[PDB]
Assembly symmetry: C2
Homo-oligomer: 189 residues x 2
């Protein structure tokens, strides 16, 4: 697969092995026409203990952009309250990047943590397009919790039943809890 | 994360639960300026038994595109023989898509298999940009074998030592073998 010449102050808990967890909410699935409307980050250590919780940011977008949400997006993000927070927000993407980067720099250096979460491949696509300065803060690797879920569904479906918002803070916290479950129930550590 | 109104003849082994494995080789890491130079696919069943091996395609590119490879790409893809096959190839991206789609349709329906392999997030980015008709054949989910490797490196590093080309067929076969190893050594199925 991919190959390149580069691919071949803060906390007393600062570590190259800390993990950056991120979730985004968007107006749709296509980075070329859709926009980021919410972001949240959390830092754990390599053992998934939460060290710090980043800013939860609703990113302002005009109605012309909200009018691109399909029916499921519109219904979901309106009912959750996210649309109202987006309309009220005075935070641009660039300000959201600045705030998030300023947060992460106290916990892990640039380029060291994989990107972690659920549906993290799709989220990274929107980082590349709309927030490349923040995308660049991650190591090239991914920790896709959804990969573990799908293999467990296929191979150990009864185990998956043991574990039970489209708001970014809830989704990222749930992803950590879900990986914590897999570590115990699937990996058996 | 992502949400949408759509996200909320052949073999006697044809199945919705068969897995499409894919690897790409590229001239670099940026889909907006770099190109796909090789692709390979393999279909397994859900238990990772190989059912079928797809076309291994070197995709023609002109020197102006090969001249974008950085030193590690140039050295690697030249020494493997891939550059010479790319220059000799008469197969365009569009023909590569047609051949690959014609292959996959005998094994699994459109939209049912996650995309499977190593570094599969980066490969899917190039599918979105350069081969959207083929990207559309995959289910939105990913099976990122690299995610399992990175968690095993952090949590069970001694186990990872038990398992030992940048040519697409070798890489995809190795990814299946590596997931087969994790299923036995890490998941303990």
């Amino acid at each position: 697969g991919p190959l390149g010449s580069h691919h071949h102050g803060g906390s007393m808990s600062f570590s190259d092995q800390n993990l950056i967890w991120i979730d985004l909410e968007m107006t749709g699935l296509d980075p070329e026409m859709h926009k980021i409307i919410e972001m949240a980050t959390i830092v754990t250590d390599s053992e998934l203990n939460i060290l710090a919780e980043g800013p939860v940011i609703a990113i302002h977008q005009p109605e012309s952009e909200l009018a691109k949400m399909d029916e499921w997006c519109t219904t979901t993000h309106t009912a959750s309250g996210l649309v109202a927070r987006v309309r009220q927000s005075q935070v641009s993407e660039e300000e959201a990047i600045d705030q998030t980067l300023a947060f992460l720099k106290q916990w892990v250096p640039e380029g060291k943590s994989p990107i972690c979460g659920n549906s993290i491949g799709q989220d990274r696509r929107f980082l590349y397009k709309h927030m490349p300065r923040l995308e660049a803060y991650f190591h090239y690797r991914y920790i896709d919790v959804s990969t573990i879920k799908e293999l467990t569904r296929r191979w150990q479906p009864e185990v998956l039943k043991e574990f039970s918002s489209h708001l970014a803070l809830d989704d990222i916290r749930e992803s950590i809890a879900e990986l914590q479950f897999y570590r115990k129930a699937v990996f058996k550590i």
